[PDB]
From a paper:
We have also solved the structure of the E1p/E2p-PSBD complex with bound 2-(1-hydroxyethyl)-3-deazaThDP at 2.5 Å resolution, representing an analog of the postdecarboxylation enamine-ThDP intermediate. We prepared cocrystals of G. stearothermophilus E1p/E2p-PSBD in complex with 2-(1-hydroxyethyl)-3-deazaThDP (he-3-deazaThDP), an analog of the enamine-ThDP intermediate. The ligand he-3-deazaThDP mimics the postdecarboxylation enamine-ThDP intermediate in both structure and charge state, but with a distorted geometry. The true enamine intermediate is sp2 hybridized at C2α, but the C2α atom of our analog is sp3 hybridized. Although a racemic mixture was used in the crystallizations, the electron density map suggests that the R enantiomer was preferred in the crystal. The H128β Nɛ atom contributes to a hydrogen-bonding network involving the OA atom of he-3-deazaThDP (distance of 3.4 Å) and the cofactor's N4′ (distance 2.5 Å). We observe that the inner and outer loops are also both ordered in the he-3-deazaThDP complex structure in all four subunits of the asymmetric unit. In the crystal structure of the he-3-deazaThDP, the pocket has few apparent fixed water molecules. Our docking model suggests that by simply flipping about the Cβ-Cγ bond, the H271α Nɛ is brought away from the thiazole and orientated toward the dithiolane ring of the oxidised lipoyl group. In one of the four asymmetric unit copies of the he-deazaThDP complex, the H271α appears to have made this flip, and this is correlated with the loss of the water molecule that links the side chain to the terminal phosphate of the ThDP.
The first step involves decarboxylation of pyruvate, which proceeds through formation of a covalent intermediate with the thiamine diphosphate cofactor (ThDP) in the active site of the pyruvate decarboxylase subunit (E1p; EC 1.2.4.2). E1p also catalyzes the second reaction step in which the acetyl group is transferred regiospecifically onto one of the sulfur atoms of a lipoyl moiety.
Residue numbers in the entry:
A (entry chain B), D (entry chain D): 1 to 324
B (entry chain A), E (entry chain C): 4 to 368
C (entry chain I): 128 to 165
């Protein structure tokens, strides 16, 4: 049952196509080609073109097509080739589908899931690796899910697809097939808006999501060699945040840092930090610091190494908080 | 030096978009060969609705000035392109209206009192009754076009023999979503009717500054779908264009773009300085003689189908129905933060669950 | 000129103690209890 | 002379059109009509259709236009009728002009200023009052400014038009004509990125921007009747933040709250709480609380009154912080 | 029931868009009237550049599979559509290229070692030399079209007798930006030339599923501007089309849309695309014979203006230069995070000043 994250993704899509006749998969090059990273491979040939198809090149169009289909009872699962391209579909996502239930007082709803890869570390061209989770996180009516392991990916996508409200599912490029993990075959779900402890610690709480989780765990092993026991928490849903799990952990360690790949003035670290300060203020022993990238535009491929935060920056920031 | 036939090219496309008309400004039939098939009782019903809709506009303006209605966009002068177009649809057809297309959804099933709540800004006004196939008016110009291609592709997939119809204005044809919408409908060969109401102005911008194209109907060419330009003050013509477009769609032949040439007798909206924004008034009198009610009136009287006694009846009926709808809008209870939160999701996420208890209490005493 | 954060601040105010009098062994936290005792 | 905010904006545009032949004003109905709220009244008649003109109805095109113009040496001052329509132009603003200097290693730059009204409390139809400055605040390479007074409005616009990098000038709909204020005739500038103290206080710091400054001042006058001295600081630039002024003020009072009109999950309040916490947490006597609207879509017109944060909300929260 | 002449509309309209051709497959002149005024020396320079661009394409692919280069979009097969179009321009003209149009900006003045830096992902690759009017390749499909209308409007306001030229693909014609651009350009009557390179594919998707329009050139009718379809494998026809467009534009007559019918013999991009999964192998041999280098070579050899001796001299000069560009890109100093901060703004705001200090220390160890 060893699978890479892209395989768990495909398997979760295969399952939902079987159980729910209303599910449809579409976007640019997702039919006969199977996608840029082969996420939808083999699906069209098994479920038919009437359920898995290519569309004209136009994100704004794909988003407007998804809303309409939902009004006719279908459960759409469109794809934006890269999340850097979400600026073209901003109105359909935030000005439309996220507000349909509220706008119609519950008469209509959008059982829609938007799949899209992001993240850096594999040297892609301009606007492909951007981290824009913070934009959609500010629109009420949406749920933003970001998995970090093959196991979390399959179960979250199924819950996402089953959700009767819009959900944005971001898949990190560097985690697609970089590692393997045990994934049970068959349907199973993981609640949306629920975080999980990836490593139990006692000295400090390290909160992260996406590819930063790996770096955090990487950093936790090094720190163990120095007597500092770190607790690593993976959010897995960046909106809503699992306040109880976050707080529960901080009111035990009394210290913490938040880790993200995005620019400091971007991302979601600011909201987690704000929330911690308002609820666990009486348990803190040190200020809650963030580990983020510089406030410049996402770097030209060649400069990813020196720009992207890695486990060494998490080692350093963790020591600052401990030596406070 | 070599010269490309660019001048001839623009002339040949123009020849392909002549203005379609059945009734001239006098009520005379100038196109027998295309006269639609309508019984005596359907023509009377088409007139009653147009007169009724004209009365609605006058009261809506009055009520808005009295502060009894909120946002409102005048429809007077556009009854043919609005009412006669909706008259060609069936109960199962889906309507995706614009901010100015409130009449259409009223006739398709949306209770009149709920249209006043929409104006005032009340969620109950948007809660469309089940089975009535419509969306609340769309404010973002162009969004309703890409959305209709979706509803349409949907009907095609369920096998249902219905159509998705949507409306936009001349200014709207400039938006990229307008283009993506009709092109997407064409690529999928979906049953969609796209209507563009050309009343010559986008707020204060004349259509001649919107594009250097001579007809808005020729824009259908970039999508590869049939385009038709019709007289927007001609009831029978707009009825025939949509009907032909309906048949074509339900037979799986694809979408059609319809440009109507109408005009507005009142302000852009009633929101700000709009009621006092510059109006030509030399241009108003001219289009005043072209009034849809005027010519259709003479068309029916010549056939002994309309008396000045039925007109008064419909006018008193619309005035009374309007008075009780505005009354019923007053009786609907005020809204609370809890009502607006309960309709954000099916299952409330933690942040809203917590926020629900805070406003619950701040409500009860 | 008084460094303590932040529950130390609320804990001293709840016990009727002025944080300025105490000598923070480490900006207090458990040495406020030592103040109340002596 | 005594001026309203809309009059201060008008005079600043005139000062700039006259001092620099490269400046151009354009957008939907900004010409002969003079704009929806008369902001550009009389400019086209004075400077000609070559400097002040109208365009087809398409936000995306207005944004692209501004980019090309600036590649040709001009200094564009484009206009979006209402900021709720920015979704339509997100790519040009954030995916293009804010990255051009960076993308060309300095070779080209974008001396552009976008003007746009926003804000609630005036009963407008859907998507006209939303507060989305949180979105633009997340893109490196932009500066977002939001005046609250006529004086600040004139000085900032002039400063925004002269800057050689992209600036978004948000003008609150409710503040356009709510009060007059003495405003010096002629040119003068207010630095971008500098907050200022509206009311001096010693017991609690109230941080606000836009139309919330007024509400905060009304709460401050109420808090005074009970002996509570509140200091009201107006940000006036939400990106970048004037850290030095904010932190310097909170360290003096020890207590602070942040106020925004935008929903809790949006706005820039979280960023403010985060910077405060990591720089002066050792001075905080209580947690920095937030006053914000429910995390729902912007309300239907009739419920604005019970949904938008007013001075009473500010008072209740301010007390909560004093009695923590 | 009454019927509208829809089928005749779609036919007549596309009749106005026949393929413009000068040189056929065997290199014979089939259109003497439109023959351009080019000297024997200009003809040899057009060939030298096409042979050179083909060699650059083969060398790029090779250096990419060696890791020497990064992102790369093959251009083999589109030499005429790209090089002969550029030949019709002058130094003052402004080019807004897309990701595959790196050849055009090279010939327009960008040092070849900088193109390779653009591929690797280094900011110095994008620092265009002053006086060379180009933008770095645009990655977001559509964006260069709405930016071209601005540039064009800019050149017009200053009174310059120059044009803005921009390129995109068949898939790019479906974007909302594609339509707003040529529509804005038309409404303002600005000197912009919009070139569409129809290589029959958008990554793996065939153009037949993008739209139902008979041709892509007809999409200009939506904006009301003239459009021309030409043989993209015909260098003498691309040059003439762009020549007539440039002249019309500098004479203040507006923009023009040019659709070239070409083909790409190579992968969509060098990332991992494999053509055998979506297009016939026998379909790659149908366009193999329509190679622009082959026909132009025969045309010249028929006038005694080309020998294999001159061709190998160009092949040599090409390899030699490619080799030098590659060594120059390697000698370029590595990129630093302080270098990325310094080019963000003219005057650094507070948050970047802090970070600048923070990263200035981390870079000194
Ligand atoms: C994307 C976008 N931009 C701007 C507006 C503001 C706006 C209106 C408000 C209502 O949002 S009404 C209107 C003019 C529409 O002109 P038209 O297309 O000719 O239609 P008509 O003449 O029937 O109004 C605009 C620009 C909008 N609604 N949506
Ligand atoms: C808005 C948007 N969507 C998707 C992409 C991804 C993408 C490319 C990468 C580069 O981002 S190349 C390409 C296909 C373009 O096909 P075309 O227009 O026919 O051009 P050509 O055949 O010359 O490649 C897409 C969809 C993009 N760049 N921009
Ligand atoms: K969903
Ligand atoms: K500026
Ligand atoms: Mg109009
Ligand atoms: Mg768009
Ligand atoms: Mg192509």
């Amino acid at each position: 049952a060893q699978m890479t994250m892209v395989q768990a993704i495909t398997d979760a899509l295969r399952i939902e196509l079987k159980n729910d006749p209303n599910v449809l998969i579409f976007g640019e090059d997702v039919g006969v080609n199977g996608g840029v990273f082969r996420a939808t491979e083999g699906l069209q040939a098994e479920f038919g073109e009437d359920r898995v198809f290519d569309t004209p090149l136009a994100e704004s169009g794909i988003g407007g097509l998804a809303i309409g289909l939902a009004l006719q009872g279908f459960r759409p699962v469109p794809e934006i080739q890269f999340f850097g391209f979400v600026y073209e579909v901003m109105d359909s996502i935030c000005g439309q589908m996220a507000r349909i239930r509220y706008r119609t007082g519950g008469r209509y709803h959008m059982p829609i899931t938007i799949r899209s890869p992001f993240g850096g570390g594999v040297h892609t061209p301009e606007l492909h690796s951007d981290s824009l989770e913070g934009l959609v996180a500010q629109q009420p009516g949406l749920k933003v899910v970001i998995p970090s392991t093959p196991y979390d990916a399959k179960g979250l996508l199924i819950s996402a697809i089953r959700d009767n409200d819009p959900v944005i599912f971001l898949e990190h490029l560097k985690l697609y097939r970089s590692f393997r993990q045990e994934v049970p075959e068959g349907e199973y779900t993981i609640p949306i808006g629920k975080a999980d402890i990836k490593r139990e610690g006692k000295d400090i709480t390290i909160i992260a999501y996406g590819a930063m989780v790996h770096e955090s765990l990487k950093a936790a092993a090094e720190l163990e060699k120095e007597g500092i026991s770190a607790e690593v928490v993976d959010l897995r849903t960046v909106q809503p945040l699992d306040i109880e799990t976050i707080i529960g952990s901080v009111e035990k360690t009394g210290r913490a840092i938040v880790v993200q790949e995005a620019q400091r003035q971007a991302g979601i670290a600011a909201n987690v930090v704000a929330e911690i300060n308002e609820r666990a203020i009486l348990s803190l022993e040190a200020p809650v610091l963030r580990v983020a990238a510089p406030d410049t535009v996402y770097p030209f491929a060649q400069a990813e190494s020196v720009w992207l935060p890695n486990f060494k920056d998490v080692i350093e920031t963790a020591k600052k908080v401990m030596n406070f | 030096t070599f010269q490309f036939p660019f001048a001839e090219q623009l002339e040949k496309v123009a020849e392909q978009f002549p203005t379609f008309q059945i009734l001239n400004e006098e009520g005379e039939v100038v196109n027998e060969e295309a006269m639609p098939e309508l019984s005596d009782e359907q023509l009377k019903e088409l007139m009653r609705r147009m007169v009724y809709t004209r009365i609605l506009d006058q009261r809506s303006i009055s009520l808005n000035r009295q502060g009894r209605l909120g946002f409102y966009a005048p429809t007077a002068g556009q009854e043919a392109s609005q009412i006669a177009s909706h008259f060609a649809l069936e109960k199962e057809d889906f309507i995706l209206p614009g901010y100015r297309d409130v009449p259409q959804i009223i006739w398709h099933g949306l209770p009149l009192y709920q249209a006043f709540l929409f104006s005032r800004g009340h969620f109950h006004g948007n809660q469309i009754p089940e089975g009535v196939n419509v969306l609340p008016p769309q404010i973002i110009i162009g969004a309703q076009y890409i959305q209709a291609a979706g509803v349409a592709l949907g009907l095609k997939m369920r096998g249902k023999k219905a159509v998705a119809i949507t409306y936009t204005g001349d200014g709207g044809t400039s938006q990229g979503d307008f283009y993506e919408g009709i092109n997407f409908a064409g690529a999928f060969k979906a049953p969609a009717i796209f209507v563009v109401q050309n009343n010559r102005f986008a707020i204060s911008t004349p259509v001649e500054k919107q594009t250097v194209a001579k007809t808005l109907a020729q824009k259908a060419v970039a999508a590869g779908i049939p385009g038709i330009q019709v007289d927007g003050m001609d009831p029978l013509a707009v009825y025939a264009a949509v009907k032909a477009a309906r048949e074509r769609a339900i037979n799986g032949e694809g979408p059609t773009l319809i440009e109507t040439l109408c005009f507005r007798y009142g302000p852009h909206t009633m929101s700000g300085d709009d009621p006092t924004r510059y109006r030509s008034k030399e241009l108003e009198n001219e289009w005043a003689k072209k009034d849809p009610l005027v010519r259709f009136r003479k068309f029916l009287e010549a056939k002994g189908l309309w008396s000045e006694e039925e007109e008064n009846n419909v006018i008193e009926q619309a005035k009374e129905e309007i008075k009780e709808a505005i009354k019923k809008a007053d009786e609907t209870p005020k809204q609370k933060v809890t009502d607006l939160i309960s309709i954000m999701f099916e299952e409330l996420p933690f942040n809203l669950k917590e926020q629900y208890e805070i406003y619950k209490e701040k409500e009860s005493k | 000129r008084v460094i303590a954060m932040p529950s130390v601040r609320k804990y001293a105010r709840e016990k009727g103690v002025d944080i300025r009098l105490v000598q923070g062994t480490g900006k207090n936290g458990r040495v406020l209890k030592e103040d109340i005792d002596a």
